[PDB]
Amino acid sequence: DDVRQYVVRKPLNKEGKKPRTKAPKIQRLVTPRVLQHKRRRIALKKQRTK
RNA sequence: UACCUGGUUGAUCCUGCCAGUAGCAUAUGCUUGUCUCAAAGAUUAAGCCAUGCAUGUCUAAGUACGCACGGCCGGUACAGUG
């Protein structure tokens, strides 16, 4: 199930500006970038043994 | 430039120290147009201190839901500045 689906969103309704909603940056979220970093670390191990 | 002048005796020479003389430091006095460098609360009290300042710091790369601002496109977690 998707954690990013269920984020607690915060409204923002101040006069003189457009009413908008903010959401936080989710931490400890698996993304392609952390997986790419993991692959890079294992690659560094590979070249060191070679 | 390895230089001298004077002072004891009625007069001569000498030992001898002193005064003058030149440099360096500090202080001070009088005077003082221009320009270039430039020391400067050590000496006496490592005495005592009013007030202000003398040490802070962010990149693409630790943490951003402060609308403090700010475009989306709209379920697009997080634009970006901060």
XYZ file of all heavy atoms in Angstrom, chain A residues 18-36:
156
model
N -4.075 33.355 -2.475
C -4.802 32.176 -2.923
C -4.815 31.119 -1.820
O -3.795 30.897 -1.156
C -4.170 31.596 -4.192
C -4.589 32.258 -5.507
C -3.966 33.631 -5.707
C -2.470 33.530 -5.949
N -1.860 34.866 -6.206
N -5.948 30.460 -1.588
C -5.978 29.380 -0.597
C -5.277 28.141 -1.131
O -5.674 27.571 -2.150
C -7.475 29.135 -0.375
C -8.186 30.267 -1.076
C -7.275 30.717 -2.164
N -4.225 27.723 -0.429
C -3.379 26.636 -0.903
C -3.176 25.625 0.208
O -3.434 25.900 1.375
C -2.004 27.119 -1.378
C -1.131 27.655 -0.259
C 0.222 28.117 -0.767
N 0.137 29.249 -1.677
C 0.362 29.170 -2.980
N 0.711 28.030 -3.550
N 0.237 30.261 -3.729
N -2.681 24.451 -0.167
C -2.438 23.367 0.771
C -0.982 22.933 0.694
O -0.443 22.735 -0.399
C -3.345 22.173 0.474
O -3.064 21.680 -0.841
C -4.813 22.562 0.558
N -0.343 22.797 1.854
C 1.012 22.273 1.929
C 1.011 20.838 2.428
O 0.121 20.417 3.172
C 1.921 23.089 2.851
C 1.894 24.571 2.666
C 2.858 25.208 3.644
C 3.592 26.377 3.019
N 4.007 27.373 4.042
N 2.039 20.104 2.023
C 2.320 18.771 2.520
C 3.792 18.712 2.896
O 4.620 19.381 2.266
C 1.996 17.697 1.469
N 4.148 17.944 3.920
C 5.555 17.869 4.316
C 6.361 17.003 3.366
O 5.819 16.206 2.599
C 5.495 17.245 5.713
C 4.243 16.480 5.726
C 3.276 17.214 4.854
N 7.679 17.175 3.420
C 8.572 16.257 2.727
C 8.688 14.987 3.553
O 9.076 15.035 4.723
C 9.946 16.885 2.504
C 10.844 16.057 1.595
C 12.120 16.770 1.205
C 13.148 16.678 2.309
N 14.456 17.243 1.901
N 8.336 13.853 2.949
C 8.266 12.600 3.683
C 9.666 12.029 3.854
O 10.421 11.888 2.884
C 7.343 11.616 2.947
C 5.885 12.041 3.084
C 7.490 10.235 3.508
C 4.948 11.251 2.204
N 10.024 11.703 5.091
C 11.319 11.120 5.402
C 11.218 9.609 5.556
O 10.143 9.068 5.830
C 11.910 11.729 6.670
C 11.947 13.226 6.659
C 13.107 13.748 5.840
O 14.262 13.642 6.240
N 12.804 14.316 4.687
N 12.371 8.947 5.403
C 12.487 7.486 5.309
C 11.509 6.915 4.290
O 10.792 5.953 4.561
C 12.312 6.796 6.661
C 13.415 7.068 7.657
C 13.164 6.293 8.935
N 14.125 6.606 9.982
C 14.065 6.116 11.211
N 13.138 5.241 11.560
N 14.948 6.523 12.116
N 11.478 7.523 3.114
C 10.640 7.069 2.019
C 11.534 6.459 0.954
O 12.518 7.078 0.541
C 9.830 8.229 1.440
C 9.172 8.012 0.081
C 8.092 6.953 0.176
C 8.603 9.306 -0.444
N 11.206 5.243 0.525
C 12.004 4.606 -0.512
C 11.674 5.232 -1.860
O 10.505 5.397 -2.234
C 11.810 3.082 -0.493
C 12.364 2.521 0.798
C 10.342 2.706 -0.603
N 12.714 5.629 -2.570
C 12.654 6.392 -3.806
C 13.683 5.763 -4.728
O 14.501 4.953 -4.284
C 12.963 7.874 -3.512
O 12.747 8.689 -4.669
C 14.392 8.048 -3.050
N 13.638 6.054 -6.032
C 14.728 5.572 -6.897
C 16.110 6.081 -6.516
O 17.104 5.406 -6.812
C 14.301 6.052 -8.290
C 12.837 6.086 -8.224
C 12.466 6.466 -6.829
N 16.209 7.232 -5.843
C 17.523 7.792 -5.545
C 18.242 7.018 -4.443
O 19.457 6.801 -4.531
C 17.398 9.268 -5.174
C 18.711 9.906 -4.758
C 18.636 11.412 -4.786
N 18.894 11.925 -6.125
C 18.704 13.182 -6.493
N 18.268 14.093 -5.641
N 18.957 13.536 -7.748
N 17.527 6.590 -3.396
C 18.190 5.832 -2.334
C 18.614 4.463 -2.851
O 19.663 3.929 -2.470
C 17.298 5.723 -1.081
C 17.191 7.065 -0.389
C 15.938 5.172 -1.399
N 17.816 3.890 -3.753
C 18.177 2.624 -4.372
C 19.393 2.785 -5.271
O 20.257 1.901 -5.320
C 16.993 2.080 -5.164
C 15.748 1.752 -4.342
C 14.612 1.332 -5.257
C 16.040 0.688 -3.301
N 19.477 3.908 -5.987
C 20.648 4.174 -6.815
C 21.895 4.362 -5.961
O 22.981 3.906 -6.335
C 20.396 5.395 -7.691
C 21.433 5.609 -8.770
C 21.086 6.767 -9.679
O 20.118 7.485 -9.444
N 21.879 6.955 -10.724
